[PDB]
Scaffold this active site. Sequence first.
Site, PDB file in Angstrom:
ATOM      1  N   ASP B 164      -1.594  28.276  28.714  1.00  0.00           N
ATOM      2  CA  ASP B 164      -0.155  28.732  29.083  1.00  0.00           C
ATOM      3  C   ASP B 164      -0.280  29.657  30.083  1.00  0.00           C
ATOM      4  O   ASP B 164       0.189  30.892  29.645  1.00  0.00           O
ATOM      5  CB  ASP B 164       0.433  28.824  27.783  1.00  0.00           C
ATOM      6  N   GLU B 404      -7.664  30.106  20.572  1.00  0.00           N
ATOM      7  CA  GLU B 404      -7.022  28.998  19.952  1.00  0.00           C
ATOM      8  C   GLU B 404      -7.790  27.610  20.145  1.00  0.00           C
ATOM      9  O   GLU B 404      -7.051  26.615  20.496  1.00  0.00           O
ATOM     10  CB  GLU B 404      -5.572  28.771  20.642  1.00  0.00           C
ATOM     11  N   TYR B 460       3.743  32.365  15.419  1.00  0.00           N
ATOM     12  CA  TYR B 460       5.038  32.225  15.755  1.00  0.00           C
ATOM     13  C   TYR B 460       6.373  31.860  14.818  1.00  0.00           C
ATOM     14  O   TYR B 460       7.158  30.795  15.053  1.00  0.00           O
ATOM     15  CB  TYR B 460       5.328  31.405  17.104  1.00  0.00           C
ATOM     16  N   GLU B 495      -1.232  37.563  18.508  1.00  0.00           N
ATOM     17  CA  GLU B 495      -0.053  37.320  19.191  1.00  0.00           C
ATOM     18  C   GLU B 495       1.094  36.777  18.156  1.00  0.00           C
ATOM     19  O   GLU B 495       0.920  36.371  17.093  1.00  0.00           O
ATOM     20  CB  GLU B 495      -0.322  35.845  19.799  1.00  0.00           C
TER      21      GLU B 495
END
Lengths: 590, 589
Positions: B164, B404, B460, B495
């Site tokens: 990303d 990740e 998230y 994150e």
Amino acid sequence: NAMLYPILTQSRMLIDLSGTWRFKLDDGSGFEKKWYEKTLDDAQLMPVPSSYNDIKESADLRDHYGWVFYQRDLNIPAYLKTQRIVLRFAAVTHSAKVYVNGTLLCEHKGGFLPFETEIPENLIRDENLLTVAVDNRIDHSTLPVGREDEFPYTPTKKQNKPNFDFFNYCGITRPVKLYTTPKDAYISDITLTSSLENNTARINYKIDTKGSAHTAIGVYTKQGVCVAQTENTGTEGSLTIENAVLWEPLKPYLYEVKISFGEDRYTLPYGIRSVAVKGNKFLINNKPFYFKGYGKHEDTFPAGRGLNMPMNAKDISLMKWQGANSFRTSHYPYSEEMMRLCDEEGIVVIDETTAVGVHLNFRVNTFDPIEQGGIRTQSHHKEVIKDLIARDKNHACVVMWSIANEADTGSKGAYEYFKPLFDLARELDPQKRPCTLVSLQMVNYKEDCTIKLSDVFCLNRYYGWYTCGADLQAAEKMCREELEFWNSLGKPFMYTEYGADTVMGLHDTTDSMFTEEYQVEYYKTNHKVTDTLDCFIGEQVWNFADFATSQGLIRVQGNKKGLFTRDRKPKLAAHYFKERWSKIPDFGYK
Amino acid sequence: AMLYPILTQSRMLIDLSGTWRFKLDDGSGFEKKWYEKTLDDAQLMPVPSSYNDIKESADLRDHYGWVFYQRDLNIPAYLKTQRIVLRFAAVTHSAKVYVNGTLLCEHKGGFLPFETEIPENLIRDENLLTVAVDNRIDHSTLPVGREDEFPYTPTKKQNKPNFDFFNYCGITRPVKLYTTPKDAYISDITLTSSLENNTARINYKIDTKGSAHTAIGVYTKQGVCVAQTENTGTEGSLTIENAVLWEPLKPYLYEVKISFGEDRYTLPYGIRSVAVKGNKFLINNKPFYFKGYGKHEDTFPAGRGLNMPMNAKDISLMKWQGANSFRTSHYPYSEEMMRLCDEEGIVVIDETTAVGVHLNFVNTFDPIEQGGIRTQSHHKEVIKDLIARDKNHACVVMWSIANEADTGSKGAYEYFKPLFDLARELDPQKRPCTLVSLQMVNYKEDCTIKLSDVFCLNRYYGWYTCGADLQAAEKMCREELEFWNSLGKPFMYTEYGADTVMGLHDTTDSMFTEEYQVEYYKTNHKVTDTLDCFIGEQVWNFADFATSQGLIRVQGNKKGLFTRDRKPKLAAHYFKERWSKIPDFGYKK
Ligand SMILES: CNc1ccc2c(n1)sc1c(N3CCN([C@@H]4O[C@H](C(=O)O)[C@@H](O)[C@H](O)[C@H]4O)CC3)nc(NC)nc12
Ligand SMILES: CNc1ccc2c(n1)sc1c(N3CCN([C@@H]4O[C@H](C(=O)O)[C@@H](O)[C@H](O)[C@H]4O)CC3)nc(NC)nc12
């Protein structure tokens, strides 16, 4: 005076000293305490090149008054001592004192032009300290000019008071480099001019040297083919260039001119082209040019005035995307990296001195005698003109010199102040290019001394912004009445500024100051007039991009007259100009 | 061995950055051997910079394949008495380097330095330096590109990032020519430290080429010698009485001066210890609390290119905000940044280029024969090269092996175990190692549990799940994080964030607004502040940055606390307040 751009050659080292330097604000005692004699204690770190004002989050640092000290270590090979060792400062804004190991090597006044000093080999130790003291103070003797005495409140601290509409960004603005040449014979300057008559393109050269040796010169195409050469030449001579390709706006061509003198080797890129004003025409290669472009600033975040080469390239790309062909170095000489890139890309440049703010009445008159309070800039103004032309004389992209921006040229004594400066620029430019001064909007414009001095009349006008705001019908009529006077003189004239503060994202279908739509309508109104005047040969907007200024009630976080934002995003008016300039040719519009 | 090039009494340093010639490959650039002559019909490109955003051309920006950079290289003949080296700090992604049409070296990996000597016999009076740069990514590159992973046929073949952030390529970091003595020179310097009472013992290993004598000396910033050992060979140790330790936000760097023959080199060096003990991350034997961000190297218009004024601005903002750390997501950063972090006292989690090692977001870690990921060999090289470059940095406290990856799937442990073993073998300081964990339903099967010293989680709650239901986000956050907290080891967020467009507002919870960004963070901290083993918070992201185009990317990634031009959103002020009240040490003691 000669200031060749430093390059890596078979005979010349080039060591960039840019990086992270130690940095310390002066508190009034830095010279008394002789800080330059030891390592800076309790210092910060500051990137070089850069303006220092915006790197940290400190208002005290941003608005500092006076001196700062930069310092770095300088550990160089002893073998360099077999060469002449030169320290080149491309720009230190505004004034500088340079020390090596506590010894003062040079001092310089003038924040936007290069200076250099030999390092005596007796001073070089095994480990060395380089200290650079930088002064930011401006007043009636500096260019640019600072004000002195011009619900009242007492400021917390003394501050500079710019007599100009951009932020007083200071520091080591452009790279510091070490370079070498041979000790006993080297090239000090190169001057090239072009002669195009009788259908024969020639390059005339003058090579200035130190020492005793043999001179040679060769001219080479892009692909490396030698098209002319001679050896054991005189200091001056000429070379015929068969099949010569001329440097043109938006179609650049640069030959490579290789000079040898003894062991010294230097290569200068060079575009062959002519410039002349004739009647109401500005002729480039004998064709009637129409300027399309901008006044710019060297302004980016966070380096302020500092050299930003990625953004230089982005800016030229944006100008070509928009259909522009030119810009003015408002209001100071720009970096040599920009000038050389403009040569490579075919962007035409109006090259302007640092002389903004020469105006004490915007009762002591600006051009009263110095002993009665008149401005004290003329002597330095002369030096800036000499140094600017010495640096930039060989650039094809430079087509005109701007001697000053918005001086008090409708007042008594202005002609007397400026006549020696125009005479100097004309004497010193080997290419004898047009000279101008950029004219402030004034009620008595018929008394502007530019009429007696300039080859092109360059007008800064704000019909629809600073006058007739939100009354563009009135702006058009007021614009026409004045510009018809200028058109009646039969000489080339142009806009070097016109614009309206515009905050990206503010909008209204109905004329409203500060909106994107009003910026377009402002320009449409002005163009309705200028497109009907045959002597109007150029339009440069104010400004290419939003830029930082001193704080105040009419500056919405800086000057917002850019076609682009500070991060180079196009407003509505930037798209308007892309369309307009797509339909206007570089040559033969009028 | 890749020491940072510096100007010394034995070493010239000549920067070759500037304006270079540049040409897109049209499919014939190698066949027609563009590297043997001056590039014809070329554009101009600044170096260092990514090339993608400099012009206004989508064909340039979205180019697939090779480009050619070139400049003239006319060097003083008397440098031929020295060993002449061309250092490329980074060329993204792969490079072929030519001098005068002779291929001198090639390199794979876009974010770590490489160098080649220039053979004396190749140097002519006038020389051409050509660098071909490949931007293509696939299942064998780090970072990983996809291959096959209202349908439409694209106009042109394009890279398909499995990550990303935008695929910025070009000569990302400076190109420099440097010299050393020919006969004898310093190749590498390795330093470790041990604190015995207030005396620090520095163990050194000095790798050299040629026959000469080695000496090491240690100096304070002010210039006082505090230790010196001469004719010491390759390995040794020395002691510093009353050593000043390097601390987060209170840096102290000694100057370590090395001489070998005529060669001389100075290495700044901070003395500090790093250890994981129980659920504590100990720096200088005190329990640290990470406060900071995942960053990117991203500015306009240079893309990924070295931007030293912005590096200084970013550290200034970090100190303004009360942060103490960041992670080099998702690739090694410039040596200039790493040296500035040593000088400024900013703690770094140093991460490899291994993002996108995940084919199911065929199994990711199936055999190469059966279509599994083909990155493990290059992955070992990146670990080797990263630790070789950054081993001596006090600011580096932990290595991140991957971001990740598919660590909840079968084969993951088998892929990563050799890489963790390699990292621990090569780091002389034996710093903690982690991988950064993707959010995943089967989180108890994440192979990080078997490998890492610190569990570093990307989560998230309130954005990619429980969006606009922060009460549910808090409950689901607590349920998972109480599991990690039950393991007894340090864990942290590397994150967590929410896309936020500056200027969008609502008093009532609404995604993409500045207020929702604050409430997202408040909700997460309600949980993390109660968890004993949670020892750090690094937001995603420091600043908005460019990505590939898509329906969920509002002109790039908007999870920055700051905009791309470094302006603070509401949540930036929130974190300034929060971090002003959380100490760097002893928050959870
Ligand atoms: C010597 N230094 C300077 C320079 C410029 C100005 C002043 N002093 S003072 C003043 C002023 N006053 C008039 C308005 N009054 C109130 O302030 C609000 C507001 O100005 O925002 C108004 O909306 C509200 O309705 C008023 O009750 C407050 C002062 N107004 C305007 N332009 C309009 N310019 C100035
Ligand atoms: C395979 N490629 C993809 C990926 C995602 C999506 C599609 N294709 S298609 C589609 C879609 N339809 C498209 C058409 N649409 C109409 O257009 C407006 C609009 O979406 O802007 C609506 O406001 C308006 O009321 C509707 O009449 C109503 C739903 N809707 C939504 N989410 C909402 N996502 C997608």
